[PDB]
Structures are given as structure tokens and as C-alpha cells.
Design an enzyme around this catalytic site. Structure first.
Site, short mmCIF file in Angstrom:
data_model
loop_
_atom_site.label_atom_id
_atom_site.label_comp_id
_atom_site.label_asym_id
_atom_site.label_seq_id
_atom_site.Cartn_x
_atom_site.Cartn_y
_atom_site.Cartn_z
CG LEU A 18 44.49 44.71 32.65
CD1 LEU A 18 44.65 43.24 32.29
CD2 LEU A 18 45.15 45.62 31.60
N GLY A 19 40.28 46.29 33.87
CA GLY A 19 38.86 46.46 33.64
C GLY A 19 38.07 46.14 34.89
CD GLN A 20 35.65 48.74 39.65
OE1 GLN A 20 34.74 48.91 40.47
NE2 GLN A 20 36.74 49.51 39.61
N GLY A 21 34.01 45.81 36.56
CA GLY A 21 32.59 45.70 36.27
C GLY A 21 31.84 45.18 37.46
CG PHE A 23 33.33 41.06 36.02
CD1 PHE A 23 33.26 42.28 35.37
CD2 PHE A 23 34.58 40.52 36.29
CE1 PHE A 23 34.41 42.94 34.98
CE2 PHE A 23 35.73 41.18 35.90
CZ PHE A 23 35.64 42.38 35.25
N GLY A 24 33.39 41.95 38.90
CA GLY A 24 34.58 42.03 39.72
C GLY A 24 35.60 42.99 39.11
CB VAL A 26 40.39 41.96 34.87
CG1 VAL A 26 41.63 41.36 34.19
CG2 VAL A 26 39.22 40.99 34.79
CE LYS A 44 36.37 37.50 35.50
NZ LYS A 44 35.26 36.96 36.36
CG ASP A 135 28.22 37.83 27.80
OD1 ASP A 135 27.49 38.62 27.16
OD2 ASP A 135 28.84 38.16 28.84
NE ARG A 139 32.65 47.37 25.70
CZ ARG A 139 32.03 48.24 26.48
NH1 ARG A 139 30.89 48.80 26.13
NH2 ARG A 139 32.58 48.57 27.65
CG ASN A 140 32.43 39.80 26.14
OD1 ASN A 140 32.88 40.54 27.02
ND2 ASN A 140 31.14 39.47 26.08
CG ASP A 153 33.48 37.98 30.35
OD1 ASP A 153 33.14 37.21 31.28
OD2 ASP A 153 33.19 39.19 30.32
#
Length: 268
Positions: A18-21, A23-24, A26, A44, A135, A139-140, A153
């Protein structure tokens, strides 16, 4: 006061990214608890490049999220801590980020005000438990299958009673937090003002045409964003109060929910 419920690792099937950053990562996944229907979830986890201080931060994130039980905060379903990898299992939000949606879909004025009130409701609950998000941005915030907005988040959230670095989201950060590193319930409020601006525009970045240092200098000297062409004047009034220079004069999220709720059932 609350605690993450542990889930058997064999109930979970990890499906897709779903999403990478930094942070790690998901993943989209499914949870098949015996005798219960199979449900979609989000899982996550940590970068393959491990470090035990990052495991603890993830487990702290889960503990913060386990205190929340609100329709406008992404829910915690449980954790997988026995074995490896570790997974934090969260509610699945079929329609993605609020940012992508308003940039790419047609939305009505009544949707724009309701999403605003829903996010204020979720932030009010977070503050009422003794935490600050630090934060907030479009987008969050994620959108469910019913297009209900929900705050996500909690990587940077901290107990109120008590930054990142070169990643500081300057365009969403109140002057006092940039200059004095004072983060508080009222810098969350400033950020929510910027989120409302994003909801009523279709550009990717607030303060379009300015870099980060130009934003900071202009804002500390009193510049404020002007009313988007398609924003109702009573809505921009609320947006403007979130950006008062003196943080003590900014409204609380409880006041914002109420002001927004009044417009939500307004015909004009």
C-alpha cells in the site's frame, strides 16, 4: 490504559504493498479469524534493515493507537509480536488518502465541509486522550468505503504532558514550532487549517511557487494564504482562525467541530 490485542500469525495473509517510506512498509492483507468472516486489513511492518529501537517505536505506535476508539481515527485491530516479522494490523481504508481523492475526483461543497468536520472530530478525540499528532496533513488522512475521513499515521505522536530533522513539513508547521520547537495542541490546530486549504484547492503544495525557506520567512512576518476561489466565506473564516499568530488565541478542536457542524447542516 488500553492494550493491543495479540493475533495468531497464521490468521494473516499479506497481499500487496500500500505504501513504502523511511518509516517502513504498509501492506494490504487479510485476517481470517476462525468462525469469523475474512476481512481486509492493513499490516504495517519494519524495513528489512532492522534495528531494535525501531521495533520499540513501532510497538509504541501501536500502544498509542490502542487508546483510540473513534469513528474518525483509523482503528487498531491488533499486533503480531511472537516470531518475525512483526506486524501492526490496522483498519483497511479502501479509498486511499484524502489528498489523492480531492486532487483527482469531483467533490461537492457538502462533502468538503463534512470531511473537514470529521477530521476535527478525530483530532478532538486524540487531544482528549492526552496526545498530540505533530504531523497532520491531507496525505495523512484516509477515506473508508463510505468516504468517512479518518486520521492515520501516529509515527510522531507524543503524550501532551511531556523533531524529525531535514524532513520537517515546513508548509504545515506553526511559526512557534519552527523557531522555538514548541509543539502543542495549537500547532496541531495550525496544521488542520492548512489541511482545510488543501481540501479546497487542487494543487499539490500549499504556498505554490515558494520554497521552504521563503515560506518560513513570509509566514513568520505575517503572510497568510488567501481564500481559495471555490471556498465559501464562512469556511475560510474558520480556516483563518487556525493561523492566528498567538497560539493561545487559536480555537480548540472542540470549538472547530462545533463551528463546522453548524455549517454542515447549512443550506448556503
Amino acid at each position: 490504559s488500553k492494550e493491543p490485542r495479540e493475533l495468531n500469525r497464521e490468521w494473516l495473509i499479506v497481499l500487496s504493498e500500500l505504501g513504502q517510506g523511511a518509516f517502513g512498509i504498509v501492506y494490504e492483507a487479510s485476517l481470517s479469524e476462525p468462525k469469523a468472516p475474512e476481512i481486509q486489513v492493513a499490516a504495517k511492518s519494519l524495513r528489512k534493515d532492522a534495528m531494535d529501537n525501531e521495533r520499540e517505536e513501532l510497538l509504541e505506535e501501536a500502544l498509542v493507537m490502542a487508546q483510540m476508539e473513534h469513528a474518525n481515527v483509523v482503528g487498531l485491530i491488533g499486533v503480531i509480536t511472537k516470531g518475525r516479522p512483526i506486524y501492526v494490523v490496522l483498519e483497511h481504508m479502501r479509498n486511499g488518502s484524502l489528498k489523492d481523492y480531492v486532487m483527482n475526483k469531483t467533490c461537492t461543497p457538502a462533502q468538503q465541509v463534512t470531511w473537514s468536520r470529521q477530521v476535527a472530530s478525530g483530532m478532538a478525540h486524540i487531544h482528549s486522550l492526552g496526545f498530540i499528532h505533530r504531523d497532520l496533513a491531507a496525505r495523512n488522512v484516509l477515506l473508508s468505503a463510505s468516504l468517512t475521513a479518518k486520521v492515520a499515521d501516529f509515527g510522531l505522536a507524543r503524550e501532551s504532558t511531556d523533531s524529525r530533522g531535514g524532513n520537517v513539513p515546513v508548509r504545515w508547521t506553526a511559526p512557534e514550532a519552527l523557531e522555538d520547537n514548541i509543539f502543542s495542541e495549537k500547532s496541531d490546530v495550525w496544521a488542520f487549517g492548512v489541511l482545510m486549504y488543501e481540501v479546497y484547492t487542487k494543487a499539490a503544495m500549499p504556498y505554490t511557487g515558494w520554497n521552504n525557506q521563503r515560506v518560513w520567512i513570509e509566514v513568520t512576518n505575517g503572510f497568510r494564504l488567501p481564500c481559495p476561489a471555490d471556498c465559501p466565506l464562512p469556511v475560510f473564516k474558520i480556516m483563518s482562525m487556525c493561523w492566528l499568530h498567538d497560539r493561545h488565541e487559536r480555537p480548540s478542536f472542540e470549538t472547530l467541530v462545533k463551528a463546522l457542524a453548524a455549517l454542515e447542516t447549512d443550506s448556503d
